[PDB]
Amino acid sequence: ATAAQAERTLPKKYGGRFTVTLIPGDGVGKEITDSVRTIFEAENIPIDWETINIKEGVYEAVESLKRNKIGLKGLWHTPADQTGHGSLNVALRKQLDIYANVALFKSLKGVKT
Amino acid sequence: KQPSIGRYTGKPNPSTGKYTVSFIEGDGIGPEISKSVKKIFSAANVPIEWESCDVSPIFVNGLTTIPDPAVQSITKNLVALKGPLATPHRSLNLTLRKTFGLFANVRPAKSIEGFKTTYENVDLVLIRENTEGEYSGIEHIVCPGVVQSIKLITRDASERVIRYAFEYARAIGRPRVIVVHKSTIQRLADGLFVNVAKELSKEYPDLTLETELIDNSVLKVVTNPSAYTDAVSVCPNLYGDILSDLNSGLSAGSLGLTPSANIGHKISIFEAVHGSAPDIAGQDKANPTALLLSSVMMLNHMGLTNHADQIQNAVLSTIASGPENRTGDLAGTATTSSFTEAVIKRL
């Protein structure tokens, strides 16, 4: 059997159009994501957002990403109190075994540092 | 007597005493190996005139066809004797069987007197289905990396080969007739072949029917070739193609000595199974024995027993004794030329 038609493991794509997951999340999340949307449709980039919003529906974020394979997200908020729910930023990563974080610290020309 | 199944319809050409037979000299050593046969035939006074024809293929509808000149000739005279020919979209030999309704390959492999090979007392006869089986054109790409080759086995095609086998076994006085198969893992396909023989078995009570797996047919034949000297084995296309080229390997170690007969319902072609040997062509080194024996097979098929036995029992078979005779391929020193006259002497 397998190889060509298989490939249920690349990023969601239908006739040239990727379907990426969008998780705005808490705080400036909602605004900062929108900025990207706007720049994206203004550049007519062939991607369609599947966008999700949420206490334990961190399930639905996982389930979505498992379909699309790729996502773009802001940060969720995390309680410090005892009966608070727990990161669920880490929950997302642990449940998808997205085990590697890369942060890029490169200074920018027009910024006083 | 001879086999009812591919019966020759005689009729010598009323104007001459003779029967008409298409030749097809073929190319390569064909020409020399050919007139070698014409001469030896002349000398023995064979009731046969040669109507040579050319099978160089046309291409009506992209599908390779065979020329009208040669078709009319061969359908008329119900018999032809072809030598070797070269290699041209459809197998030349295939469109040759399809246009003349040839369905059975008869392949004998017998030890030659005065030519020593590793195996001894090998006298083998095998009939092969040459219509269907593994060799129908049917194969499919069912998906990306997956292929199906389809083996076709029908009772109609099986019946008429198995018959010619019983009837041929009877015509050469062999008691046993073996159905080579593999009903073991090809239950339906080979099973049908086998059953069709088992059912035909009854209307040929003088012969005894045995059934053998290729497993054993190949094992036993190589351990001891003579255990099948009362043979006639019938088998589907693939087992046949292999066993016959094997049997020849036993008898002579190559197949420069092997004759084949391709029996059709009303037509029949008799050919040598060696190649065109293009590099030895013209230099007069070829070895007519192969084609020559196919002549004999043809004679018998036509009814000219006396002549066949004459040209085989004496001549060639006997002249291939004495290294001054023989050809380069058998240690001998003789030319195609000297082999032919040296043959005619003991005619």
Work out the widest C-alpha separation in chain A, in whole angstroms: 59
Total residue count of chain A as it appears in this document = 113
CATH of the domain at B145: 3.40.718.10
Pair of tokens at residue B193: 């072949």
**In which element (H, E) is residue B103 found?**
strand B102-110
- How far is the C-alpha of B280 from the C-alpha of B293, rounded, in Å? 21
Please, which residues have CB within 8 angstroms of residue B142's CB and are 6 or more apart in sequence? B148
B230: how many CB neighbours lie within 10 A of its CB?
A: 17
Using a CB-CB cut-off of 8 Å, the residues of chain A touching B144 are: 1, 3-5
Domain total in chain B: 1
- How far is the C-alpha of B64 from the C-alpha of B98, rounded, in Å? 11
Resolution in A: 3.2
How many helices (H) and strands (E) chain A has is answered by 3, 4
- How far is the C-alpha of B23 from the C-alpha of B295, rounded, in Å? 11
DSSP-assigned letter for residue B325: S
Q: Which residue has the tokens 């036995």?
A: B309
Classify residue B246 by burial, with Cβ atoms within 10 Å: 0-12, 13-18, 19+.
Answer: middle
A1 at B interface, C-beta within 8 A: yes
Please, which residues have CB within 8 angstroms of residue B224's CB and are 6 or more apart in sequence? none
**How many Cα atoms sit within 13 Å of B172 on the Cβ side?**
22
- How far is the C-alpha of B121 from the C-alpha of B112, rounded, in Å? 9
- How far is the C-alpha of A49 from the C-alpha of B344, rounded, in Å? 94
Least Cα distance to B288 among B347, B337, B250 occurs for B337
Angle of CA points B344, B277, B264, to nearest 5°: 75
Shortest alpha-carbon distance between residue B153 and chain A (Å):
28
Angle of CA points A92, A95, A100, to nearest 5°: 75
Q: Would the annotation count A93 as a binding residue?
A: yes
Angle of CA points A87, A92, A95, to nearest 5°: 120
B141 at A interface, C-beta within 8 A: no
Q: Which residue has the tokens 């095998």?
A: B126
Q: Judge contact between B237 and B262, C-beta under 8 A.
A: no
Shortest alpha-carbon distance between residue B148 and chain A (Å):
13
CA B97 remoteness from chain centre: 13
Experiment used for this model: X-ray
A42: how many CB neighbours lie within 10 A of its CB?
A: 8
CA A89 remoteness from chain centre: 11
B144 at A interface, C-beta within 8 A: yes
DSSP-assigned letter for residue B261: E
- How far is the C-alpha of B231 from the C-alpha of B207, rounded, in Å? 11
Q: Tell which of B143, B147, B148 to mutate to test the A interface (max A CBs under 10 Å).
A: B143
| Pairing label, strands B176-181, B233-235 | parallel
To the nearest 10°, report the CA torsion of B285, B287, B292, B293: 180
Q: C-alpha distances in angstroms, B142 versus B28, B146, B147, B149, B189?
A: 42, 6, 6, 10, 21
Question: Are residues B146 and A4, on separate chains, in Cβ contact within 8 Å?
Answer: no
| Pairing label, strands B123-129, B102-110 | antiparallel
Q: Judge contact between B269 and B104, C-beta under 8 A.
A: no
DSSP-assigned letter for residue B243: H
Classify residue B103 by burial, with Cβ atoms within 10 Å: 0-12, 13-18, 19+.
Answer: buried
Angle between helices B187-200 and B155-171 (to 10 degrees): 40
Q: Judge contact between B48 and B38, C-beta under 8 A.
A: no
Shortest alpha-carbon distance between residue A8 and chain B (Å):
16
To the nearest 10°, report the CA torsion of B323, B324, B327, B332: 40
Using a CB-CB cut-off of 8 Å, the residues of chain A touching B147 are: none
B137 at A interface, C-beta within 8 A: no
Q: Which residue has the tokens 């998906």?
A: B143
Least Cα distance to A75 among A95, A100, A58, A63 occurs for A58
Least Cα distance to B126 among B231, B206, B270, B208 occurs for B231
Map B88-157 to HEC letters.
Answer: CCCCHHHHHHHCCCEEEEEEEEECCCCCCCCCCCCEEEEEEECCCECCCCCEEEEECCEEEECCECCHHH
**B104: three-class secondary structure by DSSP:** strand
Please, which residues have CB within 8 angstroms of residue B133's CB and are 6 or more apart in sequence? B151, B152, B153, B236, B237, B238
Cross-strand pairs, B306: none
B84: how many CB neighbours lie within 10 A of its CB?
A: 23
Q: Tell which phi-psi region holds residue B253, choosing left (phi > 0), alpha (psi between -120 and 50) or beta.
A: left
Which structural domain range is residue B168 located in? 1-347
Question: Are residues B146 and A1, on separate chains, in Cβ contact within 8 Å?
Answer: yes
A4 at B interface, C-beta within 8 A: yes
